[PDB]
Amino acid sequence: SKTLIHAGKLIDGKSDQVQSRISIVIDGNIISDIKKGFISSNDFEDYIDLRDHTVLPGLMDMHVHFGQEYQSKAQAPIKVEREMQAILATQHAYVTFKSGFTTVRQVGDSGLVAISLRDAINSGKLAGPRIFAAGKTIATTGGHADPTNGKAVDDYDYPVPEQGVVNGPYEVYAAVRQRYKDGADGIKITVTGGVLSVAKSGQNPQFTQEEVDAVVSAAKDYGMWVAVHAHGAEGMKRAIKAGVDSIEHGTFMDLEAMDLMIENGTYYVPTISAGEFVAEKSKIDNFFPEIVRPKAASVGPQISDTFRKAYEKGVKIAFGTDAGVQKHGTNWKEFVYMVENGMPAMKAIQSATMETAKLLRIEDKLGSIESGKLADLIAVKGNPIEDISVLENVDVVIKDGLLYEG
Amino acid sequence: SKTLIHAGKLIDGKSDQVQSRISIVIDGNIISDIKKGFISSNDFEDYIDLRDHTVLPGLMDMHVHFGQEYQSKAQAPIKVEREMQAILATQHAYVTFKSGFTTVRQVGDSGLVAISLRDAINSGKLAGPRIFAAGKTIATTGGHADPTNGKAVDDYDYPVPEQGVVNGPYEVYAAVRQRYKDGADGIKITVTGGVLSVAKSGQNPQFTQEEVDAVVSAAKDYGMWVAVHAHGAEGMKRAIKAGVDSIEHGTFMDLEAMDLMIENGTYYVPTISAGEFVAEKSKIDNFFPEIVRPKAASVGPQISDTFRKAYEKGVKIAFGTDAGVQKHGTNWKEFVYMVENGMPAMKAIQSATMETAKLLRIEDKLGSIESGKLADLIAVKGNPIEDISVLENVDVVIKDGLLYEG
Amino acid sequence: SKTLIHAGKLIDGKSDQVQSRISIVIDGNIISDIKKGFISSNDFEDYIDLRDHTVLPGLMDMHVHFGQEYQSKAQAPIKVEREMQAILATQHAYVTFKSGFTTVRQVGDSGLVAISLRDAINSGKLAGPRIFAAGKTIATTGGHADPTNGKAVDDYDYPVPEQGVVNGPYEVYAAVRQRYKDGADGIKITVTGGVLSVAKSGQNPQFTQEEVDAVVSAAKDYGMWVAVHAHGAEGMKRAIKAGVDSIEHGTFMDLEAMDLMIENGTYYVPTISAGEFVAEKSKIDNFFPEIVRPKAASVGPQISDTFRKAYEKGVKIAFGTDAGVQKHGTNWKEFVYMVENGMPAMKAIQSATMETAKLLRIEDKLGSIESGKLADLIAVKGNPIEDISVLENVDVVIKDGLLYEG
Amino acid sequence: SKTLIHAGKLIDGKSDQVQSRISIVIDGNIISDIKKGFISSNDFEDYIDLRDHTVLPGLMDMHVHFGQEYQSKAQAPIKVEREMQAILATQHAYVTFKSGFTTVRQVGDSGLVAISLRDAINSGKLAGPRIFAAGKTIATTGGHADPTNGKAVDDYDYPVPEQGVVNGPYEVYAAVRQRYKDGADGIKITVTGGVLSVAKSGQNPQFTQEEVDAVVSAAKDYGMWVAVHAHGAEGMKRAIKAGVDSIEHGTFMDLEAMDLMIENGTYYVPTISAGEFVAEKSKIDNFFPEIVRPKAASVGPQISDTFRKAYEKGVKIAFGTDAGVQKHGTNWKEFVYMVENGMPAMKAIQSATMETAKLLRIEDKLGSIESGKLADLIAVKGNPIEDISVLENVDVVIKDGLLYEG
Numbered sequence A, B, C, D: 001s002k003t004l005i006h007a008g009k010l011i012d013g014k015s016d017q018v019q020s021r022i023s024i025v026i027d028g029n030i031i032s033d034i035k036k037g038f039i040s041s042n043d044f045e046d047y048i049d050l051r052d053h054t055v056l057p058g059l060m061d062m063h064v065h066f067g068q069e070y071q072s073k074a075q076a077p078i079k080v081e082r083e084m085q086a087i088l089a090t091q092h093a094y095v096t097f098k099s100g101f102t103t104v105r106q107v108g109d110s111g112l113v114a115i116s117l118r119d120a121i122n123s124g125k126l127a128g129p130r131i132f133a134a135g136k137t138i139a140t141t142g143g144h145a146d147p148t149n150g151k152a153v154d155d156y157d158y159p160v161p162e163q164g165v166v167n168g169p170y171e172v173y174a175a176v177r178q179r180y181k182d183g184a185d186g187i188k189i190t191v192t193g194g195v196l197s198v199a200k201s202g203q204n205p206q207f208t209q210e211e212v213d214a215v216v217s218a219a220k221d222y223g224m225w226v227a228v229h230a231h232g233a234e235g236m237k238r239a240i241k242a243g244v245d246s247i248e249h250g251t252f253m254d255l256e257a258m259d260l261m262i263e264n265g266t267y268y269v270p271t272i273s274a275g276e277f278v279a280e281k282s283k284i285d286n287f288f289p290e291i292v293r294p295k296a297a298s299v300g301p302q303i304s305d306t307f308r309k310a311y312e313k314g315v316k317i318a319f320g321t322d323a324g325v326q327k328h329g330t331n332w333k334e335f336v337y338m339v340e341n342g343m344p345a346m347k348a349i350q351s352a353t354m355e356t357a358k359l360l361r362i363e364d365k366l367g368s369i370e371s372g373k374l375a376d377l378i379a380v381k382g383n384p385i386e387d388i389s390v391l392e393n394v395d396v397v398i399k400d401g402l403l404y405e406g
């Protein structure tokens, strides 16, 4: 038994051309065939008529944080138990999945949220996207991802390497191995200061070359990719030269960093949305903590500008929003931002399909609508190439050959 | 006073020939003489008539885990106290000893099981084989031998170096020295991922070159041999180049690793039995944990094939079964497996006598029936060279000049 | 609206000349203009008539310890809670501020005293000088700044790196990063033994070259300056060669150390006052602990002599008293000491204005009475150039364009 | 006021000749003059008539353990509180002092015994010799001086560097600095296994070259001498090459180690007495623990032989007994042992006066009866050069110009 889909229009992920009237055949969780025109459907077990829709391969977001959504000081709850993070993550994942993103890379949570959610989803306990998690983001004492920042002296215990806070190359290995132990698919580190952390710096280098080299060599031994938070150029370059797979945000990326990324084939995940988010919010008094506000006003506005520079220079780019800052499910806005800043619509869609698939090392199974690959497809009314914002209304989502939406 | 033994046939451990009708004279715990033919016995304090038996030197198993026996999820007890491990070890050791293995190398237990058993046996508290223990196997965070794997976050404390879990060269020394402190004769490490561990990888490199070098240099200072668990080729080679004494399993051993082992004179302990064990069991649903099942199906079947390759290539080989996986006392099956995969029967017996004696650095006192060496002998009805499976019926076991069985 | 000040005499911080009759115009927290003669005041919102005073820019002390004041064994309280240190610090800061010091560099306290005081002052909770803090001084086990010295075995827990006691380069980074985490502006370490610490040595090298190099490289990544306690020449040179910003005390500074400081552009903060303090007190029986007394008698008298040598040799010098030893508010005496030991009065005043501003990296905003810079000014009756001790009677203090005293 | 002493015979520590009829004048704690013949005494405040005695300078023992005395398993108390060690140390020190040893180097105790005793004596709380302590002997995990050896798993906590058990160069520094913190004058380490420790090895190398180098460089920064326990040649050489001040025992010292010690000017402290002690006792069943007995039988007998070899080869030698093994107060027997093994009597006495003074870096103040040096003198009836065993009857002991015995 097989499923036949009549696609009015088709963006396959590889071809720079929007193809008209195509037949996609699904067998199990695989795309078994692709024929031109609308072939007869009377002989197929199931038929999905999307002649009035534009079909695309499942979309991917390389930077999400299911389990959290940034709230102002006035709105933020007093505390958030781990159980609450997990509970909220189920909903965050579902709305993201329903909006068209069938695969996501969670690069940071308290530790076991995305890992547990991924396992529950993969074993059919609930619906959601394919999740590739990094578990606890690794940082150095006081770093952007140190979970004990913003706490009075007697209100916290100094973190140990296994908890994601390290100093030196040996503690780095302990931390990387701990993520492997927790069940993570990859590694995430904050190579420079950050914005939303209750800490002084928003961009200083927080990993020594020896420490970030240790991250790469350790992750390589465990077959783990390495995503890297970085705003300041210096920390960013220590990571690019070390051989990490991707730089997130890269706010103050300079000319040298750009050529280094091109030479090493490093992926750039802009998260323009999150950038615009903190900018806008930085104008509201007491929205952010006082120590955070300055950083948000500085970093946020520069991402859109850095994005254009990186794109024109030829830096590899993969789709990433940093959803968990802004509300989950608004991932599509990232496309509109990428376009307004110089990237043509089709190139933008390819950055969330094939480019993301390569960064996650799964391009041979997902990322495009081609015979043999896994059946992850979405559909929407309208032409994304003429107005990519139409992607806000994805109304059909198929994952692993199964239809959830539509 | 002396003991005279009339051996119908004699496999001495050195000669590639089965000798007929030999007289072995035992004085104390030493083999004092070896004369041809059946000399008069009327003048000896004790006489052991084995004219209808084939005598061999005591057999050796370089890889056993007294104190445990792998059981399915359905059969496995909820918990196993240290006292229970020790209690069960007494029986495991005795049945192994009674089957003909007078000397064994225990390469791993919770920490003090084999060490305590060895001391009890050596001081005459109970009967058993000569035991050479490694105590707690050393691993890196999350490694195959990390005793805290498979445990929820709040259900375990991060292990310290002294407990056998390390990161970096200094923690390695602490761990090696701790084994010396506990009373171990040697060291055992998991240089790559493993099968029966509740962990993602079954073969990734888990020791850096610096860390495994530290293992060798540290063990050398304490006159300790180094046994190494290794399935993946990369971790395996880091260990071979570091100078370890033996590689256990070596499932995905490649051409380069083989020449390295030959050049460094490293011993290969196949444990084909354990390999075949996990393969067969991997076909039974819910026998192994879900995370373990895939690894067992992959690794297990390849050992028999790797064994043949290693043997023909000329890699040194010493007898080892990994009994503790399969039931203790079925050690003999390893011989049948070695033969079916290309090794002639006599060479197989020599690998459990003289080859094992060299790996344990005791070839000048055990390993062959020669004048001067310790009186460790076994006997069996039948010719092992024509059907080595006959070794399942060893009916005479002499250790240190004393008769236990027969 | 603006404020007009008629200054009888003016020492601006840059010019080696005392200028007569000058008009300074303050707009907000900025010095908007400087005109010659006494311009009309009828048109200014506010007028400050100081025609009978000598105006100078706000003074700076590069070495203070608000929160403590050394007391004899007989006078010292049994214990001092952290809350008491903070409470006393508010007063210590205010009297120092009222004496003319508008900016100070606190280089050491239990950890969060100066940091908390600085934040309270900067947010307008109370009056005080501009504070730049180093938080907890970093030391090696048993070092001059180890807060657990002088305690019986069962009366203390071995300190961890985050508490300011380190060993090796990795623990150094943890300690430097912890100060960044606590909110410090800079770093302070004891590179050699000290006087007031209950420890055997008063000058031995307590940081290895590798450890102090780690301090500099770590602090550089966080944009933190590095102040260094040092009496012995060897520890001092390890720090000078490492690239620290300033050497405090430098009691046994040798010819080589002097040229090194000149070559690297390192600042010398003498603290002659504190030196003379421990000398005088060392003559009183039981004033200092018995283990401290010898060190105080040795180190204290040499500072005045070393100061002259350093000055004539051309070593850069910035004003620093080590107030917290002697009473707070007597900072002015340091000027008289600098003069009596060879430094001309004007050069002394410049060392507490522009030289201090450069060491704190704020010379572009403070340190001199020049158009554009921040409005930090003081006034006194008399000519400081003819008798610098007149600075004991500063009667006008303006900070950030606001008048507190006068 | 001064004291006059008429010495029948005089061994001054420098001259290889026994001088006849000499007058020694004591002024305060100093030897103010030395005249030939017996000058008039009617004009001196005090007179000490020793015309019938042989006077020598105060004797020194470079290796003592006040606070302990090795007892058989049958005699040993169940436990020894720290308070008991200290209490017993007062007596051990006094009897040693009364036997003629005015200065001793304690190289090991639970931690604060010798340090506390030294301070009590130096401040006049009680009588005893001048003590130079090393505090807690530093060792690596399981090493000869690991205070947690011989304890069941749940009966001890893994020691930290500050407690004297280390791994790696950084932990070494923490341990050396901790001894400085406790108040030690020097450092003592066990570079190889030992005899009286409940551990497997009695001579294996237990410090890596990097670790022992760290001991020297760390101790040098604190002006501390380094004494080294060593039986095995390999560990011994790592220490000699590192630059330690003395090797204790040096049981299996080889030709290479001897030339190295000569080239580096390292002192050899034989402790022949302790050697002979464990030998004799090793013949008594159950005197030593079973794990210790073998080591004692092996090491003990070789010291006397190694001593002769070292002496003839020209290796520097300083007097040391390891009293604390054998009873305290029997220190004199070491002289008789040194003589019987090839060292002439006078050379033996010089090894406990000037040679010891050089090793303790106090040869400019003690070690010989010369004008200007401190007044530490002893007397005995008889000629030590003809029968050094006469030193068992020292009946006059003067320390710091004060008479205690006689």
Ligand code: MET
Residues within 6 Å of the ligand: A193, A194, A195, A196, A197, A249, A271, A272, A273, A274, A275, A276, A278, A299, A300, A303, A322, A325
């Ligand atoms: C895209 S703006 C930067 C957002 C990021 N989560 C940070 O806190 O630095």
Ligand code: MET
Residues within 6 Å of the ligand: B193, B194, B195, B196, B197, B249, B271, B272, B273, B274, B275, B276, B278, B299, B300, B303, B322, B325
């Ligand atoms: C011989 S198959 C491998 C068995 C080994 N005990 C493991 O778990 O990897």
Ligand code: MET
Residues within 6 Å of the ligand: C193, C194, C195, C196, C197, C249, C271, C272, C273, C274, C275, C276, C278, C299, C300, C303, C322, C325
């Ligand atoms: C200026 S004299 C030295 C004072 C310094 N606080 C010390 O204790 O060494």
Ligand code: MET
Residues within 6 Å of the ligand: D193, D194, D195, D196, D197, D249, D271, D272, D273, D274, D275, D276, D278, D299, D300, D303, D322, D325
């Ligand atoms: C002088 S024999 C050796 C004695 C030393 N205390 C040891 O236990 O090794």
Ligand SMILES: [Mg+2]
Residues within 6 Å of the ligand: A063, A065, A107, A108, A322
């Ligand atoms: Mg993020």
Ligand SMILES: [Mg+2]
Residues within 6 Å of the ligand: B063, B065, B107, B108, B322
């Ligand atoms: Mg095994």
Ligand SMILES: [Mg+2]
Residues within 6 Å of the ligand: C063, C065, C107, C108, C322
């Ligand atoms: Mg100070």
Ligand SMILES: [Mg+2]
Residues within 6 Å of the ligand: D063, D065, D107, D108, D322
């Ligand atoms: Mg000793």
